Amino acid sequence: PPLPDFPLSRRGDILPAEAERLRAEQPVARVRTMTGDEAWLVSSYELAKQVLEDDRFSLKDTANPGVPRQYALTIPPSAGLRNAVMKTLSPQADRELGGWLEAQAHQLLDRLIEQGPPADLRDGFTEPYSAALHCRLLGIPTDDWRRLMSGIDVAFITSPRTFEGSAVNWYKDLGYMVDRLNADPEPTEGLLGRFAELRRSPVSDELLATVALSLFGAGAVSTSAFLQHAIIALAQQPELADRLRAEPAVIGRAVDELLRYNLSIGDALPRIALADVRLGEVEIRAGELVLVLIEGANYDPAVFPHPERIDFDRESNPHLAFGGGQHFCPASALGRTHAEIALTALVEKLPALRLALPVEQLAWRPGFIKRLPERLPVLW
Amino acid sequence: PPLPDFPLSRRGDILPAEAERLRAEQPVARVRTMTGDEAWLVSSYELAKQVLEDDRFSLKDTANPGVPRQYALTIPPSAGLRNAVMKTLSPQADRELGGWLEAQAHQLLDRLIEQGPPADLRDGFTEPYSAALHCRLLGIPTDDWRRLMSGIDVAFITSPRTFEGSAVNWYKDLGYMVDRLNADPEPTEGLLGRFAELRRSPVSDELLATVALSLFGAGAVSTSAFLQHAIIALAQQPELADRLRAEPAVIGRAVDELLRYNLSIGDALPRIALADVRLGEVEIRAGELVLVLIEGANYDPAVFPHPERIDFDRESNPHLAFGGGQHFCPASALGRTHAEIALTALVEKLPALRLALPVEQLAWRPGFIKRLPERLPVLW
Numbered sequence: 030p031p032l033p034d035f036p037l038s039r040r041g042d043i044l045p046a047e048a049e050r051l052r053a054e055q056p057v058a059r060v061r062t063m064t065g066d067e068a069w070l071v072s073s074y075e076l077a078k079q080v081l082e083d084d085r086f087s088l089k090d091t092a093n094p095g096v097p098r099q100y101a102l103t104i105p106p107s108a109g110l111r112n113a114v115m116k117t118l119s120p121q122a123d124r125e126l127g128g129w130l131e132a133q134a135h136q137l138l139d140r141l142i143e144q145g146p147p148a149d150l151r152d153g154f155t156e157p158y159s160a161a162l163h164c165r166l167l168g169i170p171t172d173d174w175r176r177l178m179s180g181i182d183v184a185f186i187t188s189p190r191t192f193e194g195s196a197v198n199w200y201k202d203l204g205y206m207v208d209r210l211n212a213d214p215e216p217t218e219g220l221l222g223r224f225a226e227l228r229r230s231p232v233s234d235e236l237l238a239t240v241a242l243s244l245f246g247a248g249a250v251s252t253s254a255f256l257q258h259a260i261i262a263l264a265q266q267p268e269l270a271d272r273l274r275a276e277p278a279v280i281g282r283a284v285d286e287l288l289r290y291n292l293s294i295g296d297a298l299p300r301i302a303l304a305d306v307r308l309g310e311v312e313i314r315a316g317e318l319v320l321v322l323i324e325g326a327n328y329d330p331a332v333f334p335h336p337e338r339i340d341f342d343r344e345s346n347p348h349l350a351f352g353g354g355q356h357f358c359p360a361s362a363l364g365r366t367h368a369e370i371a372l373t374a375l376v377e378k379l380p381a382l383r384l385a386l387p388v389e390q391l392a393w394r395p396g397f398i399k400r401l402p403e404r405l406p407v408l409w
Numbered sequence: 410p411p412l413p414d415f416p417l418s419r420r421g422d423i424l425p426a427e428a429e430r431l432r433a434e435q436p437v438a439r440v441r442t443m444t445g446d447e448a449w450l451v452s453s454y455e456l457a458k459q460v461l462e463d464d465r466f467s468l469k470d471t472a473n474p475g476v477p478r479q480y481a482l483t484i485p486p487s488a489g490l491r492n493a494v495m496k497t498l499s500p501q502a503d504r505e506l507g508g509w510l511e512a513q514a515h516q517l518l519d520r521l522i523e524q525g526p527p528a529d530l531r532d533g534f535t536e537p538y539s540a541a542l543h544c545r546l547l548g549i550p551t552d553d554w555r556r557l558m559s560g561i562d563v564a565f566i567t568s569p570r571t572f573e574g575s576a577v578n579w580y581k582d583l584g585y586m587v588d589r590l591n592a593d594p595e596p597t598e599g600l601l602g603r604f605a606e607l608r609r610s611p612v613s614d615e616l617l618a619t620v621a622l623s624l625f626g627a628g629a630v631s632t633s634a635f636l637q638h639a640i641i642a643l644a645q646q647p648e649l650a651d652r653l654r655a656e657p658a659v660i661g662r663a664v665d666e667l668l669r670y671n672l673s674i675g676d677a678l679p680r681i682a683l684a685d686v687r688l689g690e691v692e693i694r695a696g697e698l699v700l701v702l703i704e705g706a707n708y709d710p711a712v713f714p715h716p717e718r719i720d721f722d723r724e725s726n727p728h729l730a731f732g733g734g735q736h737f738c739p740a741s742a743l744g745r746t747h748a749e750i751a752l753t754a755l756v757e758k759l760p761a762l763r764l765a766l767p768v769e770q771l772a773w774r775p776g777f778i779k780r781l782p783e784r785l786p787v788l789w
């Protein structure tokens with residue numbers, strides 16, 4: 030027979046029809062990835078939760094030489110840092126984050142209002158707003174955000190084969206972090222401040238900058254893409270923005286539901302089976318690639334009635350947008366706060382927010398870890 | 410039978426196979442445009458030259474209500490201005506243009522060199538370099554170039570139906586031109602300077618700003634897109650950049666050949682037949698839409714041997730990249746100068762210039778008047 034191909038579709042404004050058929054017909058299915066390797070695509074909520082919470086399936090080992098891949102690695106080839114890192118990802122270790130984020134959002138939003146519609150809400154909000162957040166998370170200035178976000182454009186490319194340029198891109202920004210950490214007025218504030226300190230107590234510079242880089246990349250790309258999907262929802266269903274205006278306190282339940290809904294994840298969560306395991310009806314052999322399809326789990330009608338309709342008042346919403354098990358997103362609280370504040374500012378300041386053209390004419394980015402529109406032109 | 414669909418393909422790095430079949434099989438062919446109207450696609454050099462030089466085929470009338478369209482108009486609904494305009498499009502009416510352009514190019518190029526590869530040559534060069542040129546052409550500052558280029562992103566969308574937002578976008582930047590022309594230190598220098606003067610001699614503000622807007626839009630979009638295609642050629646055939654380095658004076662013949670080669674034109678030149686005309690073997694009835702396919706003419710082997718191989722030493726190269734007949738590009742000299750200077754700077758400063766990833770993985774913009782890569786990541 031012919032294997033279904035993976036990934037599924039770049040169009041991000043409706044669930045891929047193929048993700049619905051996979052969950053219904055073959056919740057665990059063999060698929061051919063874009064590298065040509067084969068893999069197991071897990072697309073039901075129960076089975077997807079099982080894999081994520083079972084450490085016999087390993088994320089660490091998906092980067093070993095020789096294993097099957099869904100796309101080439103872009104990164105080339107245990108020390109009490111957890112604290113430096115975990116302290117930075119507690120929105121409760123920076124009391125001022127909330128109000129500072131609100132001021133950044135309104136700053137960007139006010140700039141667009143003076144210029145008048147239309148505006149591209151990716152380059153005007155979401156991109157600078159996600160760079161600014163992560164520049165502050167590290168304690169480095171927002172001056173270079175365009176250059177840092179552009180580095181993300183390359184770092185998160187999904188390519189069938191390794192490509193020159195992902196290595197050059199890695200070492201180029203790695204040098205940038207090194208430079209900020211070793212600047213003369215040694216950095217205070219942020220992970221880079223906690224890092225300059227940690228290297229006086231009684232870990233290398235390369236490895237420090239590595240953690241700074243992957244945290245900036247992983248976060249700016251993920252918050253910006255989700256936030257563009259949230260915007261598309263509010264622009265298309267304006268009754269949702271009315272709800273937010275009338276009942277501002279629902280913003281927590283609403284971001285939670287948009288998280289379940291959103292299709293910003295353009296690949297699958299990868300795991301390498303460390304042992305033979307039985308999963309649903311399929312026998313998975315050690316060394317094989319397993320791919321968790323978050324959108325299949327989060328649209329599974331066994332767990333989420335009317336999964337295709339956004340609903341802020343679900344009795345229960347135990348979605349997998351942040352992963353699960355051991356590798357559950359460490360910054361989940363930070364990601365919620367970031368989106369809650371941005372959307373609250375958006376629906377106050379642009380109350381007639383809508384798309385400037387039919388949603389079907391948005392240009393969706395090919396070949397990227399996230400599904401995102403290249404531009405997000407809106408009116409208000 | 411089923412009509413071939415138009416436009417042809419967004420991928421811009423090789424000739425669309427369908428454009429070769431149309432020229433060989435049906436040089437004049439009925440096609441269904443993206444609006445659903447039908448039209449005559451003229452794809453041979455002789456026939457395409459005929460249409461362009463025959464004023465019974467009318468560009469003016471392609472904007473009349475009711476006529477067939479290849480895409481909706483984005484603009485909504487004879488006065489001695491020709492001089493103000495023609496004086497601005499003579500690279501010989503600004504002695505300083507050459508050296509100023511060279512300084513802008515090297516400025517942008519030096520900025521990329523200090524940051525190190527990879528760089529996106531669309532956002533780093535071509536876009537700011539084409540905005541700067543056209544900001545100077547009008548005598549307005551380069552401060553807002555990002556906002557002006559973003560307006561181009563919407564103004565030149567090809568949509569099956571009119572969309573809100575193209576009108577708002579038009580009036581929004583129309584106001585910008587009006588504001589620069591009616592600024593307190595009334596503008597000197599450029600079309601806006603020649604305009605503030607022309608309205609003291611013994612034409613309305615709306616109409617003045619209209620000419621400023623369409624000239625900025627038509628030029629920034631066309632020079633930026635061609636220049637990205639020229640870059641892709643030099644990066645892929647590095648023997649061409651060696652030729653330019655060794656024999657700098659060939660830059661005129663080389664831009665001329667890249668012009669013949671380039672696929673930045675994503676639509677066809679539209680004409681409304683004012684009369685019945687016989688064209689090749691086809692009888693065209695008055696009121697019908699005729700579409701000239703520049704890439705078919707410029708790859709026609711009847712006129713250009715080995716049309717698919719870039720060649721700087723063709724005996725003759727009478728291409729149609731700039732149109733022809735009455736509506737031949739008024740700024741053709743300006744467009745050549747602009748590209749010649751940019752490419753000369755590019756191959757001096759980035760001598761190992763190449764694409765950062767396989768050319769087949771470039772993201773090509775959908776639904777736009779130009780074929781262009783969304784990003785152009787390179788190494789050197």
Ligand code: HEM
Nearest residue numbers: 244247248251252255298350351352356358359360363364
């Ligand atoms: C709305 C925003 C975000 C969404 C939807 C999201 C989603 C996810 C998901 C699904 C995972 C699990 C991946 C797996 O199991 O393989 C993950 C992992 C991760 N999250 Fe992203 N994320 C967001 C924001 C952030 C932010 C703000 C940061 C950092 C600044 C961050 C840092 C990380 C890191 C480092 C991991 C890897 C954890 C590990 O290796 O165990 N996330 N997140």
Ligand code: HEM
Nearest residue numbers: 624627628631632635678730731732736738739740743744
């Ligand atoms: C490499 C750059 C350029 C290329 C390849 C190019 C190409 C063309 C073509 C093919 C036409 C004819 C369209 C038709 O017959 O319907 C045209 C028209 C036109 N060119 Fe663009 N162009 C370039 C640069 C520029 C620049 C720099 C400006 C202005 C700043 C400009 C202004 C115009 C205008 C106003 C028209 C319309 C003329 C009319 O209505 O008769 N061009 N050009």
